[PDB]
Amino acid sequence: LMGGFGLKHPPPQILIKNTPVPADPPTTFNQSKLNSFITQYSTGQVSVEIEWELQKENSKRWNPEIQYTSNYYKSTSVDFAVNTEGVYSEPRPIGTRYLTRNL
Amino acid sequence: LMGGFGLKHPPPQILIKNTPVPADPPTTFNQSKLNSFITQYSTGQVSVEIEWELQKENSKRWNPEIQYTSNYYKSTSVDFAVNTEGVYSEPRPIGTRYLTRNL
Numbered sequence A, B: 001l002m003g004g005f006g007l008k009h010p011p012p013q014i015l016i017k018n019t020p021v022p023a024d025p026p027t028t029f030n031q032s033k034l035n036s037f038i039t040q041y042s043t044g045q046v047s048v049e050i051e052w053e054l055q056k057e058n059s060k061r062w063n064p065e066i067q068y069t070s071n072y073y074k075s076t077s078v079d080f081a082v083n084t085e086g087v088y089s090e091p092r093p094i095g096t097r098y099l100t101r102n103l
Ligand code: NA
Pocket: A069, A070, A071, A079, A080, B063, B064, B065
Protein backbone atom coordinates (compact mmCIF):
# COMPACT_ATOMS: atom_id res chain seq x y z
CA LEU A 1 0.00 0.00 0.00
CA MET A 2 2.82 2.49 0.61
CA GLY A 3 3.75 1.81 -3.00
CA GLY A 4 6.14 -0.51 -4.79
CA PHE A 5 6.62 -4.18 -5.60
CA GLY A 6 5.30 -6.94 -3.37
CA LEU A 7 7.69 -9.88 -3.21
CA LYS A 8 7.36 -13.31 -1.58
CA HIS A 9 11.16 -13.55 -1.51
CA PRO A 10 12.41 -9.94 -1.29
CA PRO A 11 16.05 -8.90 -1.06
CA PRO A 12 17.35 -10.51 2.15
CA GLN A 13 18.00 -8.53 5.29
CA ILE A 14 21.70 -7.77 5.63
CA LEU A 15 22.75 -7.76 9.27
CA ILE A 16 26.03 -6.31 10.49
CA LYS A 17 27.69 -5.96 13.89
CA ASN A 18 31.03 -5.07 15.44
CA THR A 19 32.37 -8.07 17.34
CA PRO A 20 32.71 -7.34 21.07
CA VAL A 21 36.32 -7.02 22.22
CA PRO A 22 36.82 -7.60 25.95
CA ALA A 23 38.74 -5.05 27.92
CA ASP A 24 41.16 -6.76 30.31
CA PRO A 25 39.32 -9.40 32.40
CA PRO A 26 39.89 -10.14 36.07
CA THR A 27 42.93 -12.16 37.06
CA THR A 28 41.00 -14.82 38.92
CA PHE A 29 38.10 -16.70 37.37
CA ASN A 30 34.52 -15.53 37.57
CA GLN A 31 31.30 -17.02 36.18
CA SER A 32 29.75 -13.69 35.11
CA LYS A 33 29.67 -12.71 31.46
CA LEU A 34 32.18 -9.97 30.71
CA ASN A 35 30.59 -6.53 30.66
CA SER A 36 33.71 -4.43 30.19
CA PHE A 37 34.62 -3.89 26.53
CA ILE A 38 37.03 -1.83 24.48
CA THR A 39 35.21 1.12 22.94
CA GLN A 40 35.09 0.87 19.17
CA TYR A 41 33.17 1.41 15.97
CA SER A 42 33.59 0.53 12.31
CA THR A 43 33.38 2.20 8.94
CA GLY A 44 33.76 1.19 5.30
CA GLN A 45 32.00 1.35 1.96
CA VAL A 46 28.97 -0.50 0.64
CA SER A 47 27.89 -1.05 -2.98
CA VAL A 48 24.55 -1.99 -4.44
CA GLU A 49 24.01 -2.67 -8.11
CA ILE A 50 20.56 -3.30 -9.47
CA GLU A 51 19.51 -4.22 -12.98
CA TRP A 52 16.11 -2.92 -14.04
CA GLU A 53 14.04 -4.01 -17.01
CA LEU A 54 12.29 -1.22 -18.89
CA GLN A 55 8.99 -1.41 -20.74
CA LYS A 56 9.35 1.04 -23.58
CA GLU A 57 6.54 3.37 -24.58
CA ASN A 58 4.71 2.52 -27.82
CA SER A 59 2.20 5.41 -28.12
CA LYS A 60 0.53 6.78 -31.26
CA ARG A 61 -0.54 9.92 -29.39
CA TRP A 62 0.00 12.75 -31.87
CA ASN A 63 0.40 15.69 -29.50
CA PRO A 64 3.31 16.06 -27.02
CA GLU A 65 3.15 14.43 -23.59
CA ILE A 66 3.53 15.87 -20.14
CA GLN A 67 7.12 15.56 -18.89
CA TYR A 68 8.93 16.19 -15.64
CA THR A 69 11.15 19.22 -16.21
CA SER A 70 13.56 21.44 -14.31
CA ASN A 71 12.38 25.01 -13.75
CA TYR A 72 13.48 27.47 -16.43
CA TYR A 73 13.88 30.81 -14.68
CA LYS A 74 16.54 31.98 -12.25
CA SER A 75 16.65 30.68 -8.71
CA THR A 76 18.71 31.09 -5.54
CA SER A 77 19.97 27.53 -5.76
CA VAL A 78 19.75 24.50 -8.03
CA ASP A 79 16.97 21.97 -7.40
CA PHE A 80 18.44 18.63 -6.25
CA ALA A 81 21.88 19.98 -5.41
CA VAL A 82 23.75 21.18 -2.36
CA ASN A 83 23.64 24.24 -0.15
CA THR A 84 26.16 26.92 0.43
CA GLU A 85 26.51 24.79 3.55
CA GLY A 86 26.98 21.54 1.64
CA VAL A 87 23.53 20.16 2.44
CA TYR A 88 21.82 18.15 -0.27
CA SER A 89 18.05 18.45 -0.56
CA GLU A 90 15.11 17.08 -2.54
CA PRO A 91 12.85 20.12 -3.21
CA ARG A 92 9.85 18.05 -4.23
CA PRO A 93 8.46 14.53 -4.52
CA ILE A 94 8.85 13.15 -8.04
CA GLY A 95 6.35 10.62 -9.19
CA THR A 96 6.48 8.32 -12.13
CA ARG A 97 3.35 8.96 -14.22
CA TYR A 98 4.04 11.42 -17.02
CA LEU A 99 3.57 9.48 -20.25
CA THR A 100 0.00 8.47 -21.02
CA ARG A 101 -1.71 5.31 -22.11
CA ASN A 102 -5.23 4.46 -23.30
CA LEU A 103 -7.39 2.18 -21.20
CA LEU B 1 21.55 30.71 -41.53
CA MET B 2 17.82 29.97 -41.32
CA GLY B 3 18.89 26.82 -39.51
CA GLY B 4 19.57 23.23 -40.48
CA PHE B 5 22.11 21.13 -42.37
CA GLY B 6 24.15 22.52 -45.25
CA LEU B 7 24.64 19.95 -47.99
CA LYS B 8 26.71 20.04 -51.18
CA HIS B 9 24.44 17.34 -52.63
CA PRO B 10 21.05 17.83 -50.93
CA PRO B 11 17.94 15.78 -51.63
CA PRO B 12 17.19 16.33 -55.34
CA GLN B 13 14.36 18.53 -56.52
CA ILE B 14 11.37 16.41 -57.50
CA LEU B 15 9.50 17.97 -60.41
CA ILE B 16 6.00 16.93 -61.44
CA LYS B 17 3.59 18.02 -64.16
CA ASN B 18 0.34 16.96 -65.79
CA THR B 19 0.97 16.20 -69.45
CA PRO B 20 -0.99 18.55 -71.73
CA VAL B 21 -3.87 16.85 -73.53
CA PRO B 22 -5.00 18.64 -76.69
CA ALA B 23 -8.66 19.41 -77.12
CA ASP B 24 -9.78 18.63 -80.67
CA PRO B 25 -7.45 20.33 -83.19
CA PRO B 26 -8.49 21.99 -86.43
CA THR B 27 -9.34 19.80 -89.40
CA THR B 28 -6.86 21.41 -91.75
CA PHE B 29 -3.19 21.82 -90.88
CA ASN B 30 -1.81 24.85 -89.12
CA GLN B 31 1.73 25.72 -88.01
CA SER B 32 0.74 27.28 -84.67
CA LYS B 33 1.30 25.37 -81.45
CA LEU B 34 -1.96 24.07 -80.02
CA ASN B 35 -3.35 26.33 -77.30
CA SER B 36 -6.65 24.57 -76.68
CA PHE B 37 -6.40 21.82 -74.05
CA ILE B 38 -8.69 19.54 -72.10
CA THR B 39 -9.10 20.85 -68.57
CA GLN B 40 -7.61 18.48 -66.02
CA TYR B 41 -5.72 18.00 -62.79
CA SER B 42 -4.18 15.11 -60.90
CA THR B 43 -4.11 13.71 -57.41
CA GLY B 44 -2.45 10.82 -55.60
CA GLN B 45 -0.34 10.00 -52.56
CA VAL B 46 3.30 10.67 -51.79
CA SER B 47 5.56 8.97 -49.23
CA VAL B 48 8.82 10.07 -47.69
CA GLU B 49 10.83 7.91 -45.36
CA ILE B 50 13.92 9.25 -43.66
CA GLU B 51 16.37 7.47 -41.42
CA TRP B 52 17.97 9.63 -38.74
CA GLU B 53 21.02 8.84 -36.64
CA LEU B 54 20.80 9.83 -32.99
CA GLN B 55 23.63 10.91 -30.73
CA LYS B 56 22.61 9.71 -27.30
CA GLU B 57 23.09 11.85 -24.21
CA ASN B 58 25.92 10.81 -21.85
CA SER B 59 25.58 13.35 -19.01
CA LYS B 60 26.72 13.03 -15.39
CA ARG B 61 24.59 16.01 -14.38
CA TRP B 62 23.07 15.04 -11.03
CA ASN B 63 19.99 17.26 -10.99
CA PRO B 64 17.06 16.90 -13.46
CA GLU B 65 17.18 18.61 -16.85
CA ILE B 66 14.80 21.01 -18.51
CA GLN B 67 12.33 19.17 -20.76
CA TYR B 68 9.68 20.16 -23.25
CA THR B 69 6.34 19.28 -21.67
CA SER B 70 2.63 19.54 -22.42
CA ASN B 71 0.69 21.93 -20.18
CA TYR B 72 -0.85 20.32 -17.10
CA TYR B 73 -4.01 22.27 -16.38
CA LYS B 74 -7.31 22.34 -18.23
CA SER B 75 -7.63 24.03 -21.58
CA THR B 76 -10.27 24.72 -24.23
CA SER B 77 -8.50 22.49 -26.73
CA VAL B 78 -5.50 20.19 -26.96
CA ASP B 79 -2.18 21.67 -28.08
CA PHE B 80 -1.14 20.22 -31.47
CA ALA B 81 -4.55 18.81 -32.34
CA VAL B 82 -7.57 19.82 -34.36
CA ASN B 83 -10.37 22.33 -33.96
CA THR B 84 -14.04 21.84 -33.51
CA GLU B 85 -13.79 22.83 -37.16
CA GLY B 86 -11.19 20.19 -38.00
CA VAL B 87 -8.30 22.64 -38.31
CA TYR B 88 -4.91 21.45 -37.11
CA SER B 89 -2.64 24.01 -35.47
CA GLU B 90 0.83 24.36 -33.97
CA PRO B 91 0.37 26.55 -30.84
CA ARG B 92 4.06 27.31 -30.44
CA PRO B 93 7.50 26.90 -31.99
CA ILE B 94 9.36 23.95 -30.50
CA GLY B 95 13.10 24.11 -30.46
CA THR B 96 15.60 21.39 -29.87
CA ARG B 97 17.81 22.49 -26.97
CA TYR B 98 16.57 21.08 -23.67
CA LEU B 99 19.29 18.73 -22.46
CA THR B 100 22.51 20.40 -21.37
CA ARG B 101 26.16 19.84 -22.03
CA ASN B 102 29.39 21.26 -20.57
CA LEU B 103 31.66 23.32 -22.77
NA1 NA C 1 14.42 19.95 -11.03
